[PDB]
Symmetry: D2
């Protein structure tokens, strides 16, 4: 069976990231206002528009997002957090979600629900066999939000809401979340820390964000011990490092675990041109990562694979990274990466000793995935 | 003596970088138009506005840019190149300067002259002793433009026009250009390739831009052999690498050479948040680099040091990198880097073996600087 | 029958309006570059996104644009004009279409075809009875482009291509084009000047654009004499003037003519907040204009009415003006105009003597519509 | 004597107008966020940059803004209002100043002081005879702010702070404020309502903003009765109406009153391309208005005239309207209005009966100015 779901909702493009760069604009600090916050929604909107203008949309089955219910959110998060998000969204303007950085407008909860709900909807339709696989191009992102908070531009942990749904509603015994956003998926790690029924894997730049998080020694606890896998990589890591990590750690971990569904936290902030990390992945790197993961799903869980958008901050280049992943799902490879030659000469295509050793640190942990 | 020159001209902020991201927008390639090209002038304008709003401007002596004459430009470039820039600027709209990327509007030559002329003016006033040092916050940048072309957003090689002026007009026997823009200063290298009277030093990310350029083996030719020094560094290099390069190579090179004037090609594209390179320098790193270089000038050439803006593409963070350099010139350290704590945990502050070895490759070349 | 067609194509939002305000940026004239040209595609894209986010899209039947063929374009335009547009679009960076203002990128002809083609495809589906009515939210606009040229941001005359198709392909004897864009539809007037089989009506601000065009004395020629109707209105005209014009001139003209299809050139540049005209129409005014025209179509041509987007330059307010028209097509009135109270106190709601007299100048021309 | 003062402060360009269009962005109302609020500071910054790039700055004497003190503000406003602005600015992310529209960031009071202070500092230097006249290009604007509130984007009433200073500190008996911003100067009217020592004149579009304000019957009270003059004009009024108003009402009022200083509230929102009003004034119209008013000052108060920026919302055209006024102060007429021919054919250059009659309503009030 072949039918590829695609979720975009207009409101994903309407997320109000404010007038600051990262934190808010700040006169006393002389942080001048700017039109486009680093996380501004235009970056992901440009990905969507390229999906359409490239003609990939003709090969996709558009899937409507359905708002995550309170019950949906509560499988990933605390009632206190949900209540707090209702509270801040109910406030006449809106407010600070808690961390002095992640902000939500009046009614911004509507978009957070549609983002988590997009992941849930696609998960449902893939799990049932209506669809063979899909891509949920959601916004706001999810992977930093732990059980009890919003964090790092993330209100709810979209992939964990989807996993929680696959577990509780669809009765899946084993789900895997593979997160290749360049930042550590600390939220996802936190949510499933004590839980072996969701294998949580994060490839990331070591200590990029959050600080003091994502070490290889963070392995879960209790019955969940061994079912969280962090793959911290050095700044400057490129396609060779990322593919070595896939071949040596990620794919073996998935094969050992035998998930019934694979959810990919699909960020493109590891790209060669991203401002918010120092990695060197190209569109062709993301293509190969996607191909490998989709083929793994075909081998072990009847092709059941759901990509969910996480971060990525190059409005110029992210659309082509994203499109490459979409093309691997559809099998219609109809547009070149126009940056390919320009970026290919910059490097990242040789596995450096330091990169190899960082990856090899994780291989002995594979034996504890029962 | 203490009086610090500062050059900003309104037109530096009016450079038309077009509607593309890097190359032009391109419908057949599905490269969607965007408001801010990567090189858009707002990044450097925000630096200027911070110089003003921080109160640093009160400690600076504002210096008017004076348009570089044909004679000024001809000390760095060919008559053919100048003529070609007149031609493309004279064209009813403007056009492609030659490389399919570096574009100039009708009348855009006016800004190119004022940019090179800003560097010249400041060089004159520092060399005479009217000023002790300065910063020319110019735009468009210069260091990629070789003798016979425009390249990499550079129309004229501003620091080489300034050096050419110090040589031919002021009669200096020895000038040094230290380029710490993250990209290789191939233009500057080309211009002075056969010439020992201008020592050309470039610290850069190896093969970032241009491709196949900036190797340690590129050392000049003829009488100039030994008077070009490339310090290619690996992606991910941070403050520890950059300061080791300063201490082991740059400062010893300058001391060996005994220039009568130091010109710094001062880019901030090595910053932790730059999209166009993969380096990890913070505002505090640039501060220490500037402090070291200014102190070296004080020791060897009566404090005669002229900073000239090159690249840097983070409108968020570049202003604070720049301000740190301005503060080292003025000695008035009145504003924190508000990103300091956020970026300090990401790393780059330990000298990695690979970084150390890349730097040590250049140390044996120091003996050939007579 | 009730089924409402809606045409949006991603590329409508990708039209490259450049870096100028109206004409190009110009250094010698000191016209500083700006991110958003007055005609920037975001204004119409925001209308589309509101159609979606409001939930109106759920009550619409989305219709794919199909590229206008050469044969389609030739029913409205000269082979020389078509050839010239192919030429300018084929040029490496595109070029000037002829008038020193209307520019097209490399491949920009693709968007011009999809814009005219969107109008054609909706016309076909309404005429055939598949749909009862629709709105083609196209870009670039059309009504300034006469038979032999591009003009006023218009490459092809979309409504005249659609009328030409209804005439030649669908065999309609009588088609009406009602143009309420605030600028004179000089292109449409020119194309059908000698032709009584397309009644052309233009309500506009007198002499707003083009200059020296849109006088009441411009009435067609030969067999077409009496089948062009200009309704020039004074600056400051609001809802009362526009509705008086509809009731006294427009609707009687349509009833006299008995078209088999009504095409509306639907601009919103007559809005209270438009920079490019001085009129005072509110979303409620456009609503009433749309209601009247749709009801007229129901009375005289079996409800066959096709709206085709023309101008409008308020990204803030145009979406609400547009949405009001969409709501009158769907009959689902689910969102208020949030500017209603703010704009309603500004006036325009009383028929001034000068406005009344301007309208009454046209009423004696109604008797010559046979 | 001839020396023309000019006030620009970097922070005038840093006013955070937020992410809405006019009111804040609003998800439930489906008011999508936008990069440039209507009142965004770029419009005035572009005027400043044109003053520089045109070379007018070379003929001006740059004057540093000095922050308005509490004592300065209290000559125009209540202690409650000042205290409230301190409060809202002291709040962690700032807040709503009272009217649900006029917002101020944390520390935004700094800019409000520098704006009122810029007007004061220029007034001082002109009154004292150091300067003959000047232009204070301030932001935020002032004329809507009455004694006890912020309103219509205005935190403090800059011209009334300057008048209060001329009265109390410089001991002037009679000051005139002439406000040609297109909106009614209700704040200024309120502040001096009972006071004959400040003649307050407002030319505006009738009922544009505020609603139900600016009628000819609003004439002051007590000893101030007859010393407030409103000239409400109809939508569509252009150069002919504005110049007739100057010749019939404004200039005679000033001659009758014999002020010792004229302060002009200089908005350009009456321009032909402004989104926030429906008037037809061109740069040449503003030029003639400025020429007349400066010549009047020369005749009656030793040339003592201070222009203070109010509104204006066309980033495209406002700079040229502003430059024309600057050119009349300097007497150096070195740049054309590049929109002149394009806008001159649109009209406004004939005095319509309705415009004439609106103006003539005010002429009998001239006899009560003693
Ligand atoms: C802390 C802190 N303090 N300040 C002052 C600032 C400006 C801080 N940055 N927070 C950040 C910055 C970036 C991210 C990116 C997340 C992502 O891409 N996820 O996948 C998250 C949080
Ligand atoms: C080649 C090529 N081909 N294409 C298609 C593209 C998009 C190309 N990029 N060119 C570039 C890109 C970046 C720079 C930065 C320079 C700098 O920061 N200097 O200090 C220069 C040239
Ligand atoms: C001519 C000319 N010459 N110059 C110098 C300039 C600045 C010119 N304006 N061109 C324009 C300006 C506006 C429109 C609006 C069209 C619309 O809304 N259509 O319905 C069209 C052409
Ligand atoms: C009230 C209100 N309510 N609502 C709902 C809205 C959208 C409101 N507009 N406020 C405004 C709108 C424009 C101005 C222009 C001022 C200027 O040019 N000064 O000279 C001031 C206030
Ligand atoms: K787990
Ligand atoms: K990750
Ligand atoms: K050399
Ligand atoms: K360099
Ligand atoms: K006709
Ligand atoms: K019209
Ligand atoms: K008064
Ligand atoms: K006024
Ligand atoms: Zn991320
Ligand atoms: Zn660079
Ligand atoms: Zn129009
Ligand atoms: Zn105003």
């Amino acid at each position: 069976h072949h039918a590829i779901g695609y979720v975009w909702n207009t409101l994903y493009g309407w997320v109000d990231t404010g007038t600051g760069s990262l934190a808010a604009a700040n006169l006393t600090a002389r942080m001048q206002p700017i039109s486009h916050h680093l996380a501004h929604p235009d970056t992901k909107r440009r990905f969507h528009e390229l999906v359409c203008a490239s003609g990939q949309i003709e090969h996709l089955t558009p899937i409507a997002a359905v708002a995550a219910t309170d019950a949906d959110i509560l499988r990933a998060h605390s009632a206190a957090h949900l209540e707090n998000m209702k509270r801040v969204s109910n406030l006449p303007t809106g407010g600070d979600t808690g961390d002095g950085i992640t902000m939500m407008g009046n009614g911004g909860l509507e978009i957070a629900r549609l983002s988590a709900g997009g992941a849930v909807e696609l998960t449902r339709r893939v799990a049932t066999g209506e669809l063979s696989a899909g891509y949920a191009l959601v916004n706001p992102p999810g992977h930093h939000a732990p059980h009890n908070a919003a964090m790092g531009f993330c209100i709810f942990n979209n992939t964990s809401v989807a996993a929680g749904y696959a577990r509780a509603v669809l009765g899946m015994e084993r789900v895997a979340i593979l997160d290749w956003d360049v930042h550590h998926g600390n939220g996802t790690q936190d949510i499933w820390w004590n839980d072996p029924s969701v294998l949580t894997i994060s490839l990331h730049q070591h200590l990029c964000f959050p600080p003091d998080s994502g070490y290889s020694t963070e392995r879960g606890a209790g019955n969940g011990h061994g079912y969280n896998i962090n793959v911290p990589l050095p700044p400057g890591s490129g396609n060779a490092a990322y593919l070595h990590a896939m071949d040596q750690v990620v794919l073996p971990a998935l094969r050992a675990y035998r998930p019934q569904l694979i959810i990919v936290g699909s960020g493109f902030d590891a790209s060669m041109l991203d401002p918010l990390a120092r990695m060197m992945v190209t569109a062709d790197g993301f293509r190969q990562m996607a191909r490998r993961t989709i083929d793994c799903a075909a081998d072990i869980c009847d092709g059941r694979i759901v990509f969910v958008q996480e971060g990525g901050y190059s409005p110029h280049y992210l659309p082509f990274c994203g499109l490459a992943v979409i093309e691997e799902l559809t099998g219609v490879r109809s547009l070149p990466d126009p940056y390919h030659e320009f970026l290919a000469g910059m490097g990242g295509n040789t596995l450096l000793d330091a990169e190899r050793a960082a990856i090899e640190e994780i291989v002995p942990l594979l034996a504890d995935i029962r």
